[PDB]
Design a protein around this ligand. Structure first.
Ligand SMILES: Cc1n[nH]c2ccc(-c3cncc(OC[C@@H](N)Cc4cccc(OCC5CCCCC5)c4)c3)cc12
Lengths: 20, 336
């Protein structure tokens, strides 16, 4: 399930912005 | 609306043309706790000893701002916040600086980050997501009318107040722009296609991020994710999107126009502008003036165990504030 692939990825924490 | 904006534009212009400076000092505030952190600053709960009020104070390391090339951006942020005003915008109450840092004291929003609530709960129901999206819609209509592009919409930057309403935070990329702009900035998952394709862009990027927010709010996850920006960027500039099965048709549709790569076909950036959004089916039940007046029933009310409570914020390693005996970046931040 997408929800699973999501939860299993390294992108469920706070996502910082790219200044550059 | 058009009567409201005009008037509002006039107050902003007043303050925008004569921005306020050095209206407070560090020693007047008592340090209480870190509720957020960043690449060049941290945010702390603070209490103003004279009034006994709690504020959110944003401390920016001036040297970290220079290394990361954010002087102008930082100067933009302060200049816009001391001049804007809206029910869903955090308030820049005071600002000042010292040898080492820049400071922005604002109204404290005890509800915590939508991010947190969103992650913990999994996903919001459409009526719940719709309630917050409306708030973001009006806020963007406000800002936009004043020629400001927000550029950093994301759960992490949205705060829930006491009455259960959202409060936009972080204006590090906000900027008064009449005409194309080129700065590459924001957060990966929320980057419009024009931005990633280095082609100059406009307010239309704020509406694409809106659609991203909504989807993430109704699905529990982002429409474009992977474990590394590039792979996320390909998905973004792909022109493909997949919606969950519970997403209503009106919702899939609304997202289809919002998440349109063809910025000459993307809702919000059309001839009737924002109305293509506000008058969209998914929004049929929304009483916009009601939302603006904060009289609509909040889907969820965060809990406050007392003034200055912080259970809705994570714990961050505390680091003492240091102020060198020498000014570090005088001219760069002279107008702050
Ligand atoms: C509370 C409160 N009440 N009232 C307020 C009014 C305003 C603001 C506020 C103002 N400006 C910015 C704010 O937060 C920005 C923060 N979400 C940005 C952010 C997002 C994801 C990951 C991050 O670092 C990730 C890590 C990368 C590596 C270095 C450390 C950070 C950083 C918040 C807060 C409050």
């Amino acid at each position: 399930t997408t929800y699973a692939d999501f939860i299993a990825s390294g992108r469920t924490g706070r996502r910082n912005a790219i200044h550059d | 609306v058009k009567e409201f904006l005009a008037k509002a534009k006039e107050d902003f212009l007043k303050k925008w043309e004569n921005p306020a400076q050095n209206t407070a000092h560090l020693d007047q505030f008592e340090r209480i706790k870190t509720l957020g952190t960043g690449s060049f600053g941290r945010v702390m709960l603070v209490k103003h000893m004279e009034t006994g009020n709690h504020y959110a104070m944003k401390i920016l390391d001036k040297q970290k701002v220079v290394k990361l090339k954010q002087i102008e951006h930082t100067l933009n942020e302060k200049r816009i916040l001391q001049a804007v005003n809206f029910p869903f915008l955090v308030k820049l109450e005071f600002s000042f600086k010292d040898n080492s840092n820049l400071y922005m004291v604002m109204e404290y929003v005890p509800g915590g980050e939508m991010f947190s609530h969103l992650r913990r709960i999994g996903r919001f129901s459409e009526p719940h997501a719709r309630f917050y999206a409306a708030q973001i819609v009006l806020t963007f209509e406000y800002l936009h009318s004043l020629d400001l592009i927000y550029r950093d919409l994301k759960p992490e930057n949205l705060l829930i107040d006491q009455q259960g309403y959202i409060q936009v935070t972080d204006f590090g990329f906000a900027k008064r722009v009449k005409g194309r702009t080129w700065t590459l900035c924001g957060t990966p998952e929320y980057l419009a296609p024009e931005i990633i394709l280095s082609k100059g862009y406009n307010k239309a990027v704020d509406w694409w991020a809106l659609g991203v927010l909504i989807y993430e709010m109704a699905a529990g996850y982002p429409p474009f994710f992977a474990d590394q920006p590039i792979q996320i960027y390909e998905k973004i500039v792909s022109g493909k999107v997949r919606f969950p099965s519970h997403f209503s048709s009106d919702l899939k549709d609304l997202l289809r126009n919002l998440l349109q790569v063809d910025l000459t076909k993307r809702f919000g950036n059309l001839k009737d502008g924002v109305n293509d959004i506000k008058n969209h089916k998914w929004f049929a039940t929304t009483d916009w003036i009601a939302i603006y007046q904060r009289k609509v029933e909040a889907p969820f009310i965060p809990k406050f165990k007392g003034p200055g409570d912080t259970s809705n914020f994570d714990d961050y390693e505390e680091e003492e504030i240091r102020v060198s005996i020498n000014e570090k970046c005088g001219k760069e931040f002279s107008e702050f």
